[PDB]
Amino acid sequence: IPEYVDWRQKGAVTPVKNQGSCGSCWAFSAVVTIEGIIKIRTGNLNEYSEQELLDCDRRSYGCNGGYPWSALQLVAQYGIHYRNTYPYEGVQRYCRSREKGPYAAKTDGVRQVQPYNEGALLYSIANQPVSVVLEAAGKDFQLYRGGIFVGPCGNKVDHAVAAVGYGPNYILIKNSWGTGWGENGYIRIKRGTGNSYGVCGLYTSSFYPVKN
């Protein structure tokens, strides 16, 4: 795999979003990976619906948190609408998929990256954007405004984001806290520290969609 990957340069990443106060990070993370894999497979970059996952995933807890895995499983079982068709409201409502016409995209499955393994995560990122989790509760992560981040942070993961690239000493992460946080909404988290958890627990739980 190469030294640098950046799916933004391949036109596979949509603009940075703001989840607001709702604990919907799991849905934002899943949607980044869907937008990526649909571009890779079909050539078209579209925005897909975080709100639909928020409303419709009965394995997750709405604005009180959820699971990237079950969000990706839902898209593989049913499909997902365009963001425009089912836009983000920041509050859980009833599932409105059937009112809003046919789904716009569908995937075929979900796979996990081997956990606690930096090289396995880089390998998956070289193929597509990957849903990853990290510990975001610490003030250092909250206040991050640029540079290669090394913490302080622990491994008490609590926040789902999306890995859309990497370089020699970092992994490139799209966050859902608006463009005013980090590097235009992104963070470069240091890699290669020898900590099997990853910096801020970044290697704990990583998933990506499968689309034949």
Ligand SMILES: *[C@@H](C(=O)O)[C@H](O)C(=O)N[C@@H](CC(C)C)C(=O)NCCC(C)C
């Ligand atoms: C993340 C956010 O900042 O919106 C959101 O709070 C969330 O979904 N957190 C989950 C943990 C991450 C590791 C994805 C979460 O709390 N999920 C609840 C399910 C388990 C019982 C922890």
